[PDB]
């Protein structure tokens, strides 16, 4: 039986868009049906990297499962996690992606972040994350308490450091900020390490699967 996404797309579903809330997944499917491009699936404007390839590897899976890669109540103690935005509202109440956490400063500080995950699920683990780009420099310091920010994502088959670029932009869905979404596949036994001092849209929920 195919994965039925109903009135929303693959981007909003895999990210946990509050309008695709509920929409319980399955363990297996041979194809996906969807209504594409409701504001390109991202309630917060941005760029989805390698989006065509992700859809290709999500076409046919056999052992799909959604788990918590970094629990909210731990993992991020010295940071605040309850960040929401009006662009991602649910029932007229501001919310955020059910699978990501907009980490910002807690008690005025954003300490050096470092969290790792080992793929002990004996399958491939799909990890989604993001990087945020404020529109002015004043808001960058108020949100992350740093003018120069880095986000390090390191695994055995993936390694990249993102530097946020601050620039003025038009209002897309009422927002002048952007969030670029990235992902990578973690083979069984591999370790992925997230290091950051700001602008990280940290992974909250991930996915383990086969045939992908």
């Amino acid at each position, epitope marked *: 039986a195919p994965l039925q996404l109903g009135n929303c797309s693959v981007a909003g579903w895999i990210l946990g868009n509050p309008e695709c809330e509920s929409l319980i997944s399955k363990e297996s499917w041979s194809y996906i049906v969807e209504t594409p491009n409701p504001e390109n699936g991202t309630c917060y404007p941005g760029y989805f990297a390698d989006y065509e390839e992700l859809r290709e590897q999500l076409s046919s899976v056999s052992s799909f499962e959604r788990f918590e890669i970094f629990p909210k109540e731990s993992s991020w103690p010295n940071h605040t996690v*309850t*960040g*929401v*935005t*009006a662009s991602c509202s649910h029932n007229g109440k*501001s919310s955020f992606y059910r699978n990501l956490l*907009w980490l*910002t*400063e807690k*008690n*005025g*500080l*954003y300490p050096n972040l470092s969290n790792s995950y080992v793929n002990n699920k004996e399958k491939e683990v799909l990890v989604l994350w993001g990087v*945020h*780009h*404020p*529109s*002015n420099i*004043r*808001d960058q*310091r*108020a*949100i992350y*308490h740093t003018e120069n920010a880095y986000v390090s994502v390191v695994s055995s088959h993936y390694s990249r450091r993102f530097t946020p670029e601050i620039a003025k932009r038009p*209002k897309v869905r*009422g*927002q*002048e*900020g*952007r969030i670029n979404y990235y992902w990578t596949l973690l083979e069984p036994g591999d370790t992925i390490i997230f290091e950051a001092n700001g602008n990280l849209i940290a992974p909250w929920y991930a996915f383990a699967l086969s045939r992908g």
Partner: antibody
Amino acid sequence: QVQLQESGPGLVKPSGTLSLTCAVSGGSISSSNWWSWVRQPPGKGLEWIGEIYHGGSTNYNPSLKSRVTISVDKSKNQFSLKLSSVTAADTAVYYCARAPPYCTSASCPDDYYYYYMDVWGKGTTVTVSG
Amino acid sequence: SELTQDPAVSVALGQTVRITCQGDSLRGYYASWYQQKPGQAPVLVIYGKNNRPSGIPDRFSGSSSGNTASLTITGAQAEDEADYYCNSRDSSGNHPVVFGGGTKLTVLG
């Protein structure tokens, strides 16, 4: 979490300079926070004095801008207030408070567009007299 | 500009009262409300849209409409007698902070 405690003279001579100190505990003064001052003349309403963000950024009341100086000292984990050319109008209970950071663009979470002062000191009574 | 509020209002205990604050700075940023008992420091009771800090009873609710912000106290009690101040940051210029004149609430009965 963070706690604030004012300290300073309760008496300042007319035409003199008021000088107050607020000690921050349970937190770093060099943080994303607007450390603020508020005063209250006897039987009168609250009056906002000014605020500071580490890096030298200060924002003062327009009616007080000429006589007000708010600084910060990282070594002692404290921020101060100095008001010059004091008169009877400056007799008041002075509070030091904490205001959260805020944004001026639509690129921040919703909680960064609220203004408030949640952490208040206990208050220091200053009397302008000879 | 400035925030104006009536200096005094009364409510019979058990009933509801609405403390209104008006100004040109209320459309830019959200208003916050404080409660000041005699001889004590102000305590924040409402910030944002309708968010109350931890330890503030649900009897306090806050709504805004245009250039007007309101604090509603449902089921007033004797402990609610205090001075109430509105407070907001201006969305123009260097963003100065302005306080309302304050409202003295008297609980009757």
